[PDB]
């Protein structure tokens, strides 16, 4: 593809969808791949083209809140649908959309490498992944990414970073009900996970273009109507020189 | 070009036996094993952790397996056989025995909640959406064995992991190979499977005794794909 291709990462409620929601309509040649943390609040999978004209599609469980509420139990489960269902959103994204594009750019809502290294570790980390799981999963991911992370290889990341008190509070404000118990501590550790990733960059992956990959690092702890003009001027500046 | 004929059957009917010899009667003719060591030895042994705890890991397996044989069977139509005069893969079993047999019946034993069946069959119709195609089949041979046959030759072979099995569980999983390849009944949402010629070959006998002409019929079988 010549669509560009630039994940958004950053911590939980720090401003992901709303930052980059809003930066998109910019530019008509913008599109974003939101996350999709709909389809795990409520499982479903495709109906039978007979059946579905006679039977509603049924709200399924919510495997987000399953892994909140017993993580050692569910975090494999969580983790291998979070993963499939991203990367099938971001492959169609590219197939179907900008296609009249002048300057194409597909905005993505974290990626496979956060499903990863971030969240997926640091579930294996705090005991909630066993050896087994972790393997498994890593085996999955590693060959998934062999067939498919080339057409889904980034050519930038915009780190959006806020403090982990930034992140509980605006879990507060957004209200999804699963999250309300999401301690400190949690954010804490996935904080310092994307410090290492995106900042620092001591944090060693499987994929070697990832240590290249150029990163732009946006404070945004400030109300929105603060700091957007300058975000947006960075931004801007970042994708030139892609 | 390669022609892809599964061999499905039961645990312990025969098939890595069968396929095996099948296997040399022709140099343009390879198996792409079930992929059992892997699975065994992570090393974790997520075969034993299935068996011991269904209701715990038969999730976790049933994505593993079905992904590690995804891996194996797009591995060797890559390799080997480009280059011969009638290529022939044969597949130990396939995605479509993993979903509507094996996690089909651990779903149906409550093994699987329904969270964990939903999630499954989303990523197995994704996982073939891309593949599958390149995996779809000319052929099923279909290794039939009772579960009383099938029980003994379990205990023959060995396998730690499997000698806990009870008869009822084979019993289970006989019904749905039968549904599936015998009666026809048993509904997928792959539509050309309906149409797939299906060899039926009966293993419950000793091989000392009639299986060099079950393999002729196969060579045969295969003439007609
Ligand atoms: N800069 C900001 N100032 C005030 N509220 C913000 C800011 N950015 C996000 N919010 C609010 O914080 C909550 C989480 O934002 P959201 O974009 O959903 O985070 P993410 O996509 O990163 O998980 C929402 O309630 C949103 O209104
Ligand atoms: N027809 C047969 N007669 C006697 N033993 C058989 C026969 N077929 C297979 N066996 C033996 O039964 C066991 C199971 O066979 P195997 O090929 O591993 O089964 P599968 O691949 O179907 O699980 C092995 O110990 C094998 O040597
Ligand atoms: N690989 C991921 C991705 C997201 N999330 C969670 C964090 C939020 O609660 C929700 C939406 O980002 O999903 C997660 O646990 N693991
Ligand atoms: N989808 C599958 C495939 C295989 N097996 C098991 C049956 C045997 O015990 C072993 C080797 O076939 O794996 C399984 O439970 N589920």
């Not at 971030?118 to 991911?141: G, K, P, R, V």
């Given at each position: 593809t010549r669509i560009k291709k630039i994940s958004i990462e950053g911590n939980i409620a720090a401003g992901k969808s709303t930052f980059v929601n809003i930066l998109k309509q910019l530019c008509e040649d913008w599109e974003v791949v939101p996350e999709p943390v709909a389809r795990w609040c409520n499982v479903q999978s495709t109906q039978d083209e007979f059946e579905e004209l006679t039977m509603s599609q049924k709200n399924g469980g919510?495997?987000?809140?399953?892994?909140?509420?017993?993580?050692?139990?569910?975090?494999?489960?969580?983790?291998?649908?979070?993963?499939?269902?991203?990367?099938?959103?971001?492959?169609?994204?590219?197939?179907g959309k900008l296609k009249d594009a002048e300057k194409p750019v597909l905005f993505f809502e974290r990626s496979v490498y956060s499903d990863?290294?971030?969240?997926?570790?640091?579930?294996?980390?705090?005991?909630?992944?066993?050896?087994?799981?972790?393997?498994?999963?890593?085996?999955?991911?590693?060959?998934?990414?062999?067939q498919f992370g080339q057409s889904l290889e980034l050519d930038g990341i915009?780190?959006?970073?806020?403090?982990?008190?930034?992140?509980?509070?605006?879990?507060?404000?957004?209200?999804?009900?699963?999250?309300?118990?999401?301690?400190?501590?949690?954010?804490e550790k996935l904080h310092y996970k994307h410090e290492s990733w995106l900042l620092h960059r001591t944090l060693k992956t499987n994929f070697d273009y990832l240590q290249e990959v150029p990163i732009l690092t946006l404070d945004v702890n400030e109300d929105f109507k603060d700091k957007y003009e300058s975000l947006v001027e960075k931004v801007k500046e970042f994708l030139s020189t892609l």
């Open positions: 919510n495997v987000l809140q399953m892994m909140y509420e017993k993580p050692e139990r569910w975090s494999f489960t969580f983790q291998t649908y979070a993963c499939l269902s991203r990367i099938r959103a971001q492959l169609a994204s590219l197939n990863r290294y971030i969240f997926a570790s640091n579930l294996y980390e705090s005991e909630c992944m066993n050896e087994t799981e972790w393997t498994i999963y890593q085996d999955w991911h590693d060959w998934m990414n062999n915009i780190y959006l970073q806020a403090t982990p008190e930034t992140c509980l509070h605006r879990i507060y404000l957004r209200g999804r009900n699963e999250e309300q118990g999401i301690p400190l501590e949690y954010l």
